Amino acid sequence: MQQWVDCEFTGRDFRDEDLSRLHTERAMFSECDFSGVNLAESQHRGSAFRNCTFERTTLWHSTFAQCSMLGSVFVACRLRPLTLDDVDFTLAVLGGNDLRGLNLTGCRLRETSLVDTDLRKCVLRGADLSGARTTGARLDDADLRGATVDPVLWRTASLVGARVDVDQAVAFAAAHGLCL
Amino acid sequence: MQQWVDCEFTGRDFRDEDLSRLHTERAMFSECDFSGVNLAESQHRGSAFRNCTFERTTLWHSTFAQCSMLGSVFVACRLRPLTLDDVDFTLAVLGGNDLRGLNLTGCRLRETSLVDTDLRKCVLRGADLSGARTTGARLDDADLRGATVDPVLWRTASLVGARVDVDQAVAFAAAHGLCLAGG
């Protein structure tokens, strides 16, 4: 009914539109403005939202598979619940959002900014958090096993009850100054 | 140079004496006061200083091997550099002293007060710190591998550059609330 396939949208203004239930496949949105948009229950496969503005966007109940959110900014968006399968959030900005309980297994969060983001109880198994900014980030009770993490995350994220594998526990101590 | 071999001294006032280069062997000192004493370059083997008092005592360049210091109290002493070789500090009070670089391998520090004690660069392999009071303790650059320590040490002692084995690094993470998970 709204099915956009193998399309490319650059510099488009979708300000406040009702795009609920939208289906996209291999759709490329670059530098588009999605502020105030309703994207509830949308479905996307092979699509990209590059350097887009999601200022107060509603995305709950959506499904993203093999998609990229490269460089996009998310401010006070409704991002839960969400099905994310192999989604790339590289260089995206998600500070201040509530991501609790999301399953981010195997997603790329390279250089993703997570300042004061709530990730408590997230499943981050196998995800790439390299270069991520976790100032103020809450990862309490998150499952981090197998995730790639830099020393700085161990020093800055809140990690009470976070589940870590044996090499991560050792990396946490080295990040605090201990020498192995 | 004096030698006290197989001697027992109980409740003795040794305050302010010059005991430099003193050698003791299998000597027993119970509740003796060594405050203000010069024990520089003294050598001790199999001796015990039980519930003794050491305030402003100098032990600079001395050697203690298989000795006991159980319950003794050390306040503002010169305690380095010097040689330790299996010495029992159980229940001793070493708070506020500078023990930097000392070899505490195999030493028992059970219930030892190490409050504000400087242990930087010490070697503590095989030492037992169970129940030790370590608030303010400095362990930066110490070698802790193989030592036995309570979880609380990981939250109280400074540990920048300290060397640890894998099980200790895991305990450190656990001591800061991380949950070790298999898989």
Side-chain angles (χ1 to χ4, degrees):
Chain A
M1 179 167 62
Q2 214 61 268
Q3 169 70 54
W4 311 343
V5 182
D6 299 304
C7 292
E8 196 160 319
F9 300 94
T10 301
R12 308 308 169 212
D13 169 22
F14 291 99
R15 268 181 294 173
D16 302 285
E17 283 188 27
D18 173 357
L19 297 178
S20 55
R21 234 154 268 231
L22 164 63
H23 280 47
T24 73
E25 275 200 46
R26 298 179 305 273
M28 200 343 278
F29 297 84
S30 173
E31 305 142 72
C32 299
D33 187 354
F34 282 104
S35 312
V37 170
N38 182 359
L39 239 341
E41 311 199 306
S42 55
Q43 286 183 40
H44 315 268
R45 184 185 176 179
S47 293
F49 297 76
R50 194 217 320 180
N51 298 133
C52 291
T53 312
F54 290 95
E55 158 79 28
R56 307 187 89 198
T57 300
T58 291
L59 300 182
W60 54 24
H61 307 293
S62 298
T63 294
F64 292 80
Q66 293 84 50
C67 293
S68 163
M69 297 296 196
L70 173 70
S72 283
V73 188
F74 300 83
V75 191
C77 294
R78 291 173 172 119
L79 298 166
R80 299 166 68 242
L82 203 50
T83 303
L84 300 166
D85 186 65
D86 185 22
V87 170
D88 189 351
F89 287 99
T90 289
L91 290 155
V93 177
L94 283 149
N97 290 279
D98 178 358
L99 272 31
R100 292 173 295 127
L102 289 173
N103 190 328
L104 302 162
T105 289
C107 300
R108 269 193 196 155
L109 293 128
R110 267 221 157 211
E111 285 192 65
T112 300
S113 188
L114 301 163
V115 178
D116 294 319
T117 296
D118 197 344
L119 295 108
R120 297 171 287 166
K121 294 177 158 164
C122 287
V123 171
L124 277 153
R125 293 189 70 182
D128 195 355
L129 288 144
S130 295
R133 185 186 176 181
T134 53
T135 311
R138 310 174 77 176
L139 278 172
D140 313 84
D141 301 312
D143 187 347
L144 298 176
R145 291 176 290 160
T148 303
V149 176
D150 286 319
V152 64
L153 192 145
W154 299 125
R155 291 186 292 266
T156 60
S158 177
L159 299 154
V160 180
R163 292 182 70 196
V164 292
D165 63 46
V166 71
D167 300 297
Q168 290 176 321
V170 167
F172 176 84
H176 284 78
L178 287 56
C179 297
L180 218 56
Chain B
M1 200 174 306
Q2 308 195 63
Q3 300 200 52
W4 298 338
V5 181
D6 294 310
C7 285
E8 174 149 347
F9 294 97
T10 304
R12 302 294 302 171
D13 186 349
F14 290 105
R15 292 179 289 184
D16 298 328
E17 295 186 6
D18 177 356
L19 296 187
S20 54
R21 295 166 301 276
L22 171 62
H23 284 38
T24 78
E25 176 152 44
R26 297 182 302 279
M28 181 71 247
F29 299 92
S30 191
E31 291 167 39
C32 292
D33 196 333
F34 295 91
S35 305
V37 174
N38 184 354
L39 262 160
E41 294 174 322
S42 70
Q43 294 185 22
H44 311 267
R45 186 178 160 286
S47 294
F49 304 74
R50 191 185 203 84
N51 296 139
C52 289
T53 300
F54 300 89
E55 306 185 14
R56 292 169 269 81
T57 303
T58 305
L59 298 182
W60 180 78
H61 274 26
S62 70
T63 296
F64 291 79
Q66 291 86 26
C67 287
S68 171
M69 294 286 209
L70 189 134
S72 288
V73 174
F74 300 80
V75 176
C77 289
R78 184 155 186 42
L79 259 22
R80 64 179 296 280
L82 57 75
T83 307
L84 297 189
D85 183 359
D86 182 16
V87 171
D88 186 358
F89 285 101
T90 292
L91 281 170
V93 176
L94 287 163
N97 290 278
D98 183 0
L99 278 41
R100 283 183 283 182
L102 294 193
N103 181 11
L104 290 151
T105 294
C107 298
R108 294 198 156 159
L109 292 145
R110 302 174 183 175
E111 302 194 54
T112 304
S113 173
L114 296 167
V115 179
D116 299 316
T117 303
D118 198 347
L119 305 127
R120 294 184 287 172
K121 287 189 159 83
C122 291
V123 173
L124 294 113
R125 314 196 56 166
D128 178 8
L129 287 74
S130 305
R133 173 47 189 320
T134 56
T135 305
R138 294 165 85 66
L139 278 170
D140 309 274
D141 295 307
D143 183 349
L144 294 173
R145 294 171 293 172
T148 295
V149 321
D150 297 332
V152 64
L153 184 128
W154 302 124
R155 296 186 292 273
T156 50
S158 56
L159 299 154
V160 178
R163 311 178 63 176
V164 302
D165 48 56
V166 169
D167 277 324
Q168 289 178 317
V170 169
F172 177 89
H176 284 76
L178 275 70
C179 293
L180 181 75

